[PDB]
Amino acid sequence: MEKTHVQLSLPVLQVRDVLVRGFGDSVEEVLSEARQHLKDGTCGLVEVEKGVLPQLEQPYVFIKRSDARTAPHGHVMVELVAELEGIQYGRSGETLGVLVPHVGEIPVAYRKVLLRKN
C-alpha cells in the first residue's frame, strides 16, 4: 500500500530540451498525470529562472518545499501545487522547480526529494 511519502531522485532538465512541455489541460488532470509519471519514473524537473515558464505549457505543476527540518536521508520534503492563469491550487513553501514528463532527455543533475504522494 502507499506510504505517505516516497524518496525519489528526479532528473533536472534544461527547458530547451523538453519535448513534452506539460501534463495536460486542467488543474486536476496535470496533478493526476504528474503523480502517475512520478510513480512510473517518467517525471523530470525544470528549475525556474527568467524565461522558463513562458516556454512551458499551462497549467503548471510545481514541487514546493513542505517543511524545514525534514531533510531525511538527504531528500527535501516536497508537495505538488498547480497553477493556471495566475491562481494556485495548494499553498506551500518555496518552489524547487516545475515538473514535466521525461521522455529520454539527458539531464544536467538530479534533485533528491521526499515527495508527499497526495
Ligand X SMILES: Nc1n[nH]c2cccc(Cl)c12
Q: Which residues bind ligand X (CB under 6 A)?
A: 2, 6, 35, 38-39, 115, 117
C-beta closer to ligand X: residue 9 or 55: 9
Shortest distance (Å) from residue 49 CB to ligand X: 25
Shortest distance (Å) from residue 117 CB to ligand X: 4
Which residues partner with 100 through β-bridges? Answer: 44
Which cell is 48 given? 525556474
C-beta closer to ligand X: residue 35 or 75: 35
CB 116 within 8 A of CB 5: yes
Shortest distance (Å) from residue 72 CB to ligand X: 16
* Cα 35 to Cα 37: distance, rounded to the nearest angstrom: 6
CB 93 within 8 A of CB 36: no
C-beta closer to ligand X: residue 14 or 92: 92
Which cell is 4 given? 505517505
